[PDB]
Design a protein around this ligand. Structure first.
Ligand SMILES: [Cl-]
Ligand SMILES: [Cl-]
Length: 164
């Protein structure tokens, strides 16, 4: 299992513009196009992202390309963020993948806001961090997904994902 495989399980794969859990427009493997309510705004961002008149549809390759850019950007965003980098550098490989998952999902800014949890993770207080992470809108909105990432941070293993 690796980050790619992990996120591909959590986000799925759709080749046509779709609404995410929050009502925004995405395409591919959780690639956010626009937060705006217009399908046109979305088709426009989409063609601009792919570099061609897509007409709301892309291929698998195209989806994977966006995905690759999105993971890379997540990592790069963690590394340039003053609150995140330290956390990330203190973690083992599996748990680093759990932090990238939350960043890809919610943005660097969103994550950096989990101040108390970040500190606990940094301290290696697994169970405490898990309980703290759970007290969030994130967990309440997408509990199944949240449970997987939290277990990942709690255990340092890919158990929540083996079987999927
Ligand atoms: Cl893009
Ligand atoms: Cl969920």
């Amino acid at each position: 299992m690796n980050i790619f495989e992990m996120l591909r399980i959590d986000e799925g794969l759709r080749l046509k513009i779709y609404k995410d859990t929050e009502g925004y427009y995405d395409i591919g493997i959780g690639h956010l196009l626009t937060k705006s309510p217009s399908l046109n705004a979305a088709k426009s961002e989409l063609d601009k992202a792919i570099g061609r008149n897509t007409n709301g549809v892309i291929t698998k390759d195209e989806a994977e390309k966006l995905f690759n850019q999105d993971v890379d950007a997540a990592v790069r965003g963690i590394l340039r963020n003053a609150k995140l980098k330290p956390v990330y550098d203190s973690l083992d490989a599996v748990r680093r993948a759990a932090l990238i998952n939350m960043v890809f999902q919610m943005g660097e800014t969103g994550v950096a806001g989990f101040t108390n949890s970040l500190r606990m993770l940094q301290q290696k207080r697994w169970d405490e961090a898990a309980v703290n992470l759970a007290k969030s809108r994130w967990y309440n909105q997408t509990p199944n997904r949240a449970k997987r990432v939290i277990t990942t941070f709690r255990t340092g293993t890919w158990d929540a994902y083996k079987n999927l």
